[PDB]
From a paper:
SimC7, which belongs to the short-chain dehydrogenase/reductase (SDR) superfamily, catalyzes reduction of the C-7 carbonyl of the angucyclinone, and the resulting hydroxyl is essential for antibiotic activity. SimC7 is made up of two domains, the larger of which is the nucleotide binding domain that adopts a Rossmann fold; the smaller substrate binding domain, characteristic of the so-called extended SDR subfamily (Kavanagh et al., 2008), is mainly α-helical and is largely formed by two insertions in the nucleotide binding domain (between β6 and α6, and between β9 and α10). Our results reveal that SimC7 is structurally distinct from previously characterized polyketide ketoreductases and, importantly, lacks the canonical SDR Ser-Tyr-Lys catalytic triad (Kavanagh et al., 2008, Kallberg et al., 2010, Persson and Kallberg, 2013).
To investigate this possibility, we determined the structures of SimC7 alone (apo; 1.6 Å resolution), the binary complex with NADP+ (1.95 Å), and the ternary complex with both NADP+ and 7-oxo-SD8 (1.2 Å). Overall the apo, binary, and ternary SimC7 structures are very similar, with the notable exception of the lid motif, which displays a number of different conformations.
Residue numbers in the entry: 2 to 279
Write the structure that this text describes.
Amino acid sequence: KILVTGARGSIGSRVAGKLVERGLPVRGGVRDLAAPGLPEGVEAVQADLTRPETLARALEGVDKVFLYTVPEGIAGFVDEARAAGVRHVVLLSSIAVTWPDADRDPIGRMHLAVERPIEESGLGWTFVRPEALATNALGWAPEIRGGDMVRCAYPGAYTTPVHEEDIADVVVAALTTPGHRSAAYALTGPETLTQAEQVALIGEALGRAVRCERMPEQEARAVLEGLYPAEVVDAILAGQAARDGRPAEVLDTIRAVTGRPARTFREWAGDHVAAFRP
């Protein structure tokens, strides 16, 4: 049995589906059993890391777990995993842990505080460490739906966005094929792209020009305070200013693990085109 936590999510849903396709018994962690909103063949379970007694029942007879970095409860998970006889944990982490002075960064520190307890536990592990998720572009969907323009603080800020399906394929490979125990994979998409480049690629999927223009930082800060705590807004804008005009690193890891080219953001945009139009 494999437990896929967050089995309703972008990545977890695809992992669980692909595992059922291979004829494997899959448990899917969900918020509510009346739902469950999961692929055919996945057994819905509560796997709430803030209630470790739910974890104990979720892990009964489970061989392997796909885990997403919970903000709370990793020590409780490690305990119950050990006691249940789990042999392999695949963790969705972040490429931030690989950067210099990752302790000095909040995002880096958050992910390190989940990796380290797993690393020190005695459990078999694989870490999957993506850069920016392509799915972050869905945040522009409401704006793109109504306009020919996305306004942002840093149109020139680079990321290397990774398609969720590639992440899911790497996770599935780590769970079902040999050579991934104690491996930590840094995943990027095949191209480093500016925000403005990404917007234009969504325009291409839609078949119409979508521009990306600079807005003053204070305006951008105000709007972002509509979505986030003022502290987090400050950190977002600092990260974007640092990546402004700075191509991010492109890694070959997806191809090296899966044997298939990494999916492009152009491909991503086409796959998700329905989100961007009426």
